[PDB]
């Protein structure tokens with residue numbers, strides 16, 4: 248199972264790790280992708296996860312969008328985890344850089360409650376432009392299922408742990 252995580256709460260764990268490497272090692276039931284509404288996995292966590300699947304994640308995602316249309320900001324869909332996990336839960340956090348409502352971050356994290364255990368990044372962090380300290384706070388106050396957070400950046404990981412209330 249998951250190893251080397253620091254326990255933050257009864258159900259939230261955190262590790263300084265590359266979520267792609269973490270997923271390839273653990274092969275969790277669910278890996279969360281930091282998706283956009285179009286499932287266009289160009290960069291950040293999404294680009295990295297998609298590149299690890301040899302673009303199979305993007306091919307599957309394009310078929311999903313062709314059939315269903317875009318997701319909502321704050322919404323999600325379950326697709327294959329390919330070589331990374333049994334499933335990938337594509338979750339759309341608000342992208343502050345595109346002027347999206349930060350209040351939708353709680354709705355985005357609520358998607359995690361449909362899965363007993365997940366490997367995930369901090370939603371809306373990184374290239375999505377939100378404050379990762381705020382994202383972790385919303386995560387701990389919203390997710391009730393077991394969430395293993397992978398934080399790529401060591402300096403950000405240290406700041407998140409050291410400032411965690």
Ligand SMILES: CNCc1cnn(-c2ccccc2)c1
Nearest residue numbers: 265266267291292295373399
């Ligand atoms: C083998 N490394 C793949 C890779 C590239 N980028 N990231 C990454 C970036 C931001 C957030 C999480 C992960 C992982």
